Amino acid sequence: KVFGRCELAAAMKRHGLDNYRGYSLGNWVCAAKFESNFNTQATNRNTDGSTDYGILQINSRWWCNDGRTPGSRNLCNIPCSALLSSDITASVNCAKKIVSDGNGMNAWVAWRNRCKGTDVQAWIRGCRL
Numbered sequence: 001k002v003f004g005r006c007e008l009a010a011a012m013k014r015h016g017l018d019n020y021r022g023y024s025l026g027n028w029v030c031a032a033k034f035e036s037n038f039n040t041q042a043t044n045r046n047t048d049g050s051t052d053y054g055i056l057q058i059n060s061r062w063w064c065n066d067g068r069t070p071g072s073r074n075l076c077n078i079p080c081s082a083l084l085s086s087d088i089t090a091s092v093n094c095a096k097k098i099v100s101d102g103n104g105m106n107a108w109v110a111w112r113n114r115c116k117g118t119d120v121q122a123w124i125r126g127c128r129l
């Protein structure tokens, strides 16, 4: 599924991401935009052989099991393919564990490089939220 900007914002808010660990909703929408272009089916391989999955590009090195990342962890206790669903529940619940791990949203390279320190509230402007 390719989400619209306000559609995703509304769904993230319903799932409790707005101001989760202090990150306003615009941060999460900005992160999804530059991680996946709002596409739930996005995948990208990393140099170490792990793979990033879904709208928030969650990595198989730590967070999910894809059967092809030996020596890795599965801290969200899910198969990585669950992160590609049109239903973003699994992605959001796993993202809540990531952002809680001590590094905040700095865990997402695209957030630190393209969202942090910008006007992230612009990403929800015009939405009925």
Ligand code: NA
Binding pocket: 060, 061, 062, 063, 064, 065, 066, 069, 072, 073, 074
């Ligand atoms: Na894994």
